[PDB]
Amino acid sequence: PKEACPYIPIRMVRLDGESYGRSYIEEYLGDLRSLENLQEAIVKMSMIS
Amino acid sequence: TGLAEDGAKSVYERLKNDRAPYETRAQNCAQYTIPSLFPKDSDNASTDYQTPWQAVGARGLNNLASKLMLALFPMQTWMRLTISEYEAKQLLSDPDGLAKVDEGLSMVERIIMNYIESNSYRVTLFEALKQLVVAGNVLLYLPEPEGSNYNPMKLYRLSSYVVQRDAFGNVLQMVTRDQIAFGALPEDIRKAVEGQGGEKKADETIDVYTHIYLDEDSGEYLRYEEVEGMEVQGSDGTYPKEACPYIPIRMVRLDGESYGRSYIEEYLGDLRSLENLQEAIVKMSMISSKVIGLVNPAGITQPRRLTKAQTGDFVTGRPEDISFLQLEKQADFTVAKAVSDAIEARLSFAFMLNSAVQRTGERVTAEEIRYVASELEDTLGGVYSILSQELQLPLVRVLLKQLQATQQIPELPKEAVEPTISTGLEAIGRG
Numbered sequence: 180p181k182e183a184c185p186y187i188p189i190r191m192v193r194l195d196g197e198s199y200g201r202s203y204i205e206e207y208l209g210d211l212r213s214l215e216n217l218q219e220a221i222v223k224m225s226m227i228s
Numbered sequence: 229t230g231l232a233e234d235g236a237k238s239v240y241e242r243l244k245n246d247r248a249p250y251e252t253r254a255q256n257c258a259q260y261t262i263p264s265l266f267p268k269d270s271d272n273a274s275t276d277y278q279t280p281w282q283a284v285g286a287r288g289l290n291n292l293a294s295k296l297m298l299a300l301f302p303m304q305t306w307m308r309l310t311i312s313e314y315e316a317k318q319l320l321s322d323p324d325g326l327a328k329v330d331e332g333l334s335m336v337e338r339i340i341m342n343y344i345e346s347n348s349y350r351v352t353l354f355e356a357l358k359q360l361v362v363a364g365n366v367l368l369y370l371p372e373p374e375g376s377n378y379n380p381m382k383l384y385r386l387s388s389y390v391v392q393r394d395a396f397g398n399v400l401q402m403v404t405r406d407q408i409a410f411g412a413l414p415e416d417i418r419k420a421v422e423g424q425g426g427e428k429k430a431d432e433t434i435d436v437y438t439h440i441y442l443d444e445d446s447g448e449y450l451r452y453e454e455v456e457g458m459e460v461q462g463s464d465g466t467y468p469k470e471a472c473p474y475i476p477i478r479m480v481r482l483d484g485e486s487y488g489r490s491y492i493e494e495y496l497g498d499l500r501s502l503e504n505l506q507e508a509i510v511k512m513s514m515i516s517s518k519v520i521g522l523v524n525p526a527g528i529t530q531p532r533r534l535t536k537a538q539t540g541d542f543v544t545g546r547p548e549d550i551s552f553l554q555l556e557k558q559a560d561f562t563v564a565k566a567v568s569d570a571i572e573a574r575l576s577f578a579f580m581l582n583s584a585v586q587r588t589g590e591r592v593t594a595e596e597i598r599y600v601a602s603e604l605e606d607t608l609g610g611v612y613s614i615l616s617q618e619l620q621l622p623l624v625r626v627l628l629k630q631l632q633a634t635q636q637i638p639e640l641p642k643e644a645v646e647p648t649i650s651t652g653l654e655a656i657g658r659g
Contacts, residue, residue: 222501225567228560 236437236454254363261285281507288579308650393486401441505568620651
């Protein structure tokens, strides 16, 4: 039965009409992307230094 | 014998090529944290391991092993024996019988600590934990009690042994390579070498291979020792299913990968970037240390009078004639130091460098252990949980089986003889 199925798909961020959930980080992924680019250049300028 | 048809030698060689990337990672990881822990195959007795230009990795790695050591293996109990003769009937029926049974579990749990106490198991675990941080994998072997004689574990570095796993996570076959002198060989091993033929000098070392593989017919591990391509007679043995003394340990487990990866590998890049910055900072001061007197050739002043003159001597010259060469890189030094300090900050948290979190306090209590256990889950992912299942649980089970022969549990049923084992935070503390 549905209530007793041992196969448990768990979606953390649910959207209507989507079979799969989405990650929490994805909304900050566009923000970590900006952070990494800034920290990438900061270290690389130090490598010149 | 499908797995062992080629023999221990051949199966070791082909599977060794699989672990070649992993030993390359461990050597690279060790090169930056502590070059001594994981040495290359070539260098021996004349290595002269150069110190890393930054000590953050070395300081953090020692801290990481110690913090794991406190929580995983404190003086407080770290295994819990829970008795369930029935899933639910044990509590309902025969309650006072459980108290007699539960009394037995305490003594069996107590004698485990005494067994840990006598044979100095705690010393080898610290080395295994330190190897786990720098190298992805380590293998621990628990030899048979063989009476009351002193019995330490044998720790196999990733270089020595080899293992094959499926995407399931189970082990198909493992081979350990051991080089022991002919005189130091076990007596059973010696007669096989003599039985093989050929005189061997005492100081000459003979490698031995112990191959454990799954039988295709039955899910039971089969163990045998092979010397010089010849199996040792009488060494054949069938380890209990999923109870082999060998405990292959991976700190970080990845799917479809037979080995594991070091925790330092997560931050090796930030480690080597700090290596480059600190190396240039030190080298910059080396240039600055050297003194060079730049004498203006158009000047009146001549160095001959300056050197020959005693202290407090009037010498014909002008101060602006004499100048000294100086390293003027100040903006570069401050930006590199600013970036280097920032990189130490991220590595300080990842390695949990001391911030009076555990240094404070001159006593060791179960409460502090739980504080470290919570901290070890906040950082390092969940290796505290992973190592508890991967390392603590197999470690207790093998010892529990051996201690059954040594100490006869008062209760005959095997469930009371072999209670379910809990090695998590529930084990830490009284309960």
